[PDB]
Design a binder for this molecule. Structure first.
Ligand code: CLA
Ligand code: CLA
Ligand code: CLA
Ligand code: CLA
Ligand code: CLA
Ligand code: CLA
Ligand code: CLA
Ligand SMILES: CCCCCCCCCCCCCCCCCC(=O)OC[C@H](CO[C@@H]1O[C@H](CO)[C@H](O)[C@H](O)[C@H]1O)OC(=O)CCCCCCCCCCCCCCCCC
Ligand SMILES: C/C(C=C=C1C(C)(C)C[C@H](O)C[C@@]1(C)O)=C/C=C/C(C)=C/C=C/C=C(C)/C=C/C=C(/C=C/[C@@]12O[C@]1(C)C[C@@H](O)CC2(C)C)CO
Ligand SMILES: CC(/C=C/C=C(C)/C=C/[C@@]12O[C@]1(C)C[C@@H](O)CC2(C)C)=C\C=C\C=C(C)\C=C\C=C(C)\C=C\[C@@]12O[C@]1(C)C[C@@H](O)CC2(C)C
Lengths: 177, 168
């Protein structure tokens, strides 16, 4: 009856055990929202998209700062400020990436709403397993848990890197030391 | 359910299997409120127009017709051809063809039996049975889509950088 994460709180009604990373940590009861097209399905899809985006962004920042930029690309070690140097010399790359992300996000929203309507697609599912790393069950749950935990950690990390780069105008590991 | 192209999206519910080049790609559901034959005709018309346009752009940046008016790049050829009246002739004959097309598409939508884009233009055969016709329709659709995207890229690159045939 009590949430596993917060023993002083009752179990959130909509979070039983199903989703990976579920420990009952919903103090504000946001999982019970059923308005403005927002429900547990939409919240989970948003959480998974945030997890994946944060993982990609943190990996990119760390890669560029440690191993350096790719040939022909600007340096500076400040990832929040090197973006304007890339846009100053290769605006077409940024524009094409933005257009591609826009199209993919329109497709993602359509897929989310459709799967919410005629329930056949789990939240965050895009059938993207080209290498077959999660075919069999009893490993899919473990992979989902790993992805969720890594994505939450990378969300926090990427938000921290964004704020550090905006404020200190220095590199992430530069702030570290 | 679970359209072939986008495996996580539902089938567009208007494209089951009985159209050439039908991989179930309609995420925004254009076929849900527009006739399928109308959209097919529009797509095939775009394919043919853009194939001709890509070939003409690339060729005219290499070979020029005799005369001083034809000595401009394809990027600047529009303002020269419109002034000389060269594009007026193309406009006149294209308008005639498109009025006949108005009649044809109206008849196709109101029964008839004319397949979308089927003008029966076939001096040579190149398509003897149903299988050959289907294969060549798929080839035409794929080549037309590729040429539409290719002309888009060619024009955008040439406008961005006023370069010759290599528009990099
Ligand atoms: C420009 C084109 C474009 C379009 C049309 C979309 C469309 C969409 N995105 Mg999206 N996105 C884009 C570009 C785009 N994205 C780019 C370039 C990125 C960064 C790589 C993202 C990152 C992103 C994330 C991380 C999420 C979406 C989500 C969504 C969906 C919810 C839209 C909504 O209600 O937001 C309303 C618009 C807002 C700005 C509201 C957000 C306000 C928050 C509180 C800002 C917090 C800032 C703090 C620091 C929708 C399908 C969400 C989703 O799929 O949920 C299911 C989601 O979680 N997008
Ligand atoms: C959220 C994900 C994300 C985003 C938005 C970016 C964004 C960027 N990266 Mg990047 N990167 C990422 C993840 C990401 N990266 C990951 C996961 C890795 C590791 C594989 C890298 C490795 C990487 C390198 C090695 C370099 C960049 C560079 C760049 C910049 C120019 C390239 C470009 O337009 O990207 C779109 C590019 C393609 C689609 C190709 C741009 C600011 C370049 C740069 O200027 O860095 C300073 C560069 O040299 N990235
Ligand atoms: C810690 C990293 C990590 C892990 C463990 C997973 C794990 C998973 N992802 Mg995933 N993903 C990640 C990062 C990760 N992701 C990032 C950064 C992105 C953004 C590019 C995505 C984008 C993504 C999509 C679009 C989809 C998945 C899917 C999946 C599931 C099946 C595929 C699989 O076995 O992947 C195993 C992954 C690894 C072994 C990581 C090796 C490095 C599985 C639970 C699919 C899913 O949810 O199906 C239901 C799916 O459609 N992921
Ligand atoms: C994900 C984990 C994580 C880690 C390891 C760090 C680590 C660090 N952060 Mg940080 N941060 C994080 C998340 C994290 N942050 C998040 C989620 C945010 C909010 C978006 C911030 C916002 C933030 C700011 C605004 C600043 C730091 C600073 C720092 C550095 C000084 C640490 C300290 O105690 O100084 C005290 C240190 C390298 C400081 C720094 O760069 O020092 C020069 C600094 O000014 N962080
Ligand atoms: C979308 C189709 C299209 C359009 C609008 C244009 C437009 C133009 N072309 Mg052009 N061209 C095209 C296709 C096209 N071309 C193709 C496919 C080729 C390859 C043979 C060429 C080869 C070409 C050359 C070599 C030159 C031009 C030039 C020009 C410019 C002025 C003279 C002229 O009209 O061309 C004259 C066109 C030709 C001599 C060949 C056209 C052959 C046609 C397109 C193929 C048969 C299709 C058939 C007749 C369709 C019937 C239509 C129906 C309604 C009845 C003008 C901007 C001239 C210029 O100023 O260059 C900058 C020039 O020197 N074009
Ligand atoms: C790769 C080029 C290509 C291909 C394979 C086709 C294929 C086809 N076209 Mg077609 N077409 C094209 C370009 C192409 N088109 C262009 C650029 C135009 C504009 C002038 C047209 C205008 C056109 C008309 C007006 C008609 C067709 C028709 C046809 C079909 C029977 C004729 C045939 O076998 O064509 C053979 C073509 C080739 C072998 C291409 C090589 C040429 C060098 C077939 C599906 C007919 C149809 O709808 O039948 C069902 C018909 O009435 N086409
Ligand atoms: C049909 C496929 C195709 C191919 C092979 C290329 C190929 C290329 N494009 Mg491109 N492009 C295409 C379609 C294509 N484009 C489309 C449909 C658009 C949108 C209209 C663009 C918009 C575009 C821009 C804006 C730029 C390129 C650039 C480039 C070059 C890098 C390379 C030669 C770049 C380049 O070198 O331009 C000078 C560049 O800046 N492309
Ligand atoms: C930003 C604009 C907000 C848009 C609101 C969309 C839905 C939000 C909503 O209705 O839930 C608002 C959420 C949902 O609140 C939940 O509602 C459920 C019934 O609908 C149950 O009653 C839950 O117990 C209750 O917590 O409540 C809060 O988050 C209030 C927290 C305020 C903290 C201030 C510090
Ligand atoms: C209606 C809609 C879409 C939809 C739909 C459909 C289509 C109807 C389908 C469904 O049926 C429903 C629904 C709702 O899904 C809404 C669209 C979404 C919006 C409104 C898009 C918002 C995106 C904004 C982002 C993601 C911007 C991020 C900015 C960053 C800046 C980066 C910086 O580097 C910059 C530039 C400068 C640097 O110095 C430092 C920083 C600041 C870090 C980080 O990235
Ligand atoms: C949109 C795009 C790029 C957009 C870039 C933009 C907006 C950037 C704009 C800017 O930089 C400028 C210009 C100047 C700056 O000052 C301002 C900004 C704004 C910064 C590229 C698309 C590029 C699109 C591309 C490359 C498409 C390739 C498509 C292929 C290969 C298709 C293949 C098929 O069609 C066939 C062949 C057969 C079919 O049946 C099957 C498939 C597979 C679908």
């Amino acid at each position: 009856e009590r949430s596993k994460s917060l023993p002083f709180l009752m179990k959130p009604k909509n979070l039983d055990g199903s989703m990976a990373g579920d420990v009952g940590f919903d103090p504000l009861g946001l999982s019970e929202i059923n308005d403005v097209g927002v429900d547990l399905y939409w919240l989970r899809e948003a959480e998974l998209k945030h997890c994946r985006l944060g993982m990609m962004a943190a990996a990119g920042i760390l890669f560029v700062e440690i191993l350096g930029p790719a040939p022909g690309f600007p340096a500076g070690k400040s990832q929040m400020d090197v973006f304007w140097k890339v846009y100053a010399e290769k605006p077409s790359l940024i524009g094409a990436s933005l257009a591609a992300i826009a199209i993919l996000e329109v497709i993602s929203g359509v897929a989310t709403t459709q799967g919410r309507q005629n329930g056949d697609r789990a939240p965050g599912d895009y059938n993207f397993d080209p290498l077959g790393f999660g075919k069999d069950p009893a490993k899919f749950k473990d992979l989902q848990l790993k992805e969720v935990k890594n994505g939450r950690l990378a969300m926090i990390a990427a938000a921290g890197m964004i704020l550090q780069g905006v404020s200190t105008h220095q590199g992430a590991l530069e702030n570290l030391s | 359910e679970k359209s072939k192209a986008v495996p996580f999206l539902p089938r567009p519910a208007a494209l089951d299997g009985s159209v050439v080049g039908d991989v179930g790609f309609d995420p925004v559901g254009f076929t849900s409120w527009l006739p399928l034959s109308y959209l097919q005709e529009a797509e095939i018309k775009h394919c043919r127009i853009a194939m001709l346009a890509t070939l003409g752009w690339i060729v005219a940046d290499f070979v020029h017709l005799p005369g001083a008016v034809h000595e401009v790049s394809s990027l600047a050829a529009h303002d020269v051809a419109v002034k000389s009246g060269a594009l007026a002739q193309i406009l006149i004959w294209t308008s005639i063809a498109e009025a006949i097309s108005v009649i044809a598409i109206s008849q196709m939508l109101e029964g008839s039996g004319r397949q979308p884009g089927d003008f029966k233009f076939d001096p040579l055969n190149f398509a003897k049975d149903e299988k050959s016709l289907k294969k060549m329709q798929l080839s035409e659709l794929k080549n037309g889509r590729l040429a539409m995207l290719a002309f888009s890229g060619i024009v955008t690159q040439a406008a961005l950088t006023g370069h010759a045939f290599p528009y990099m």
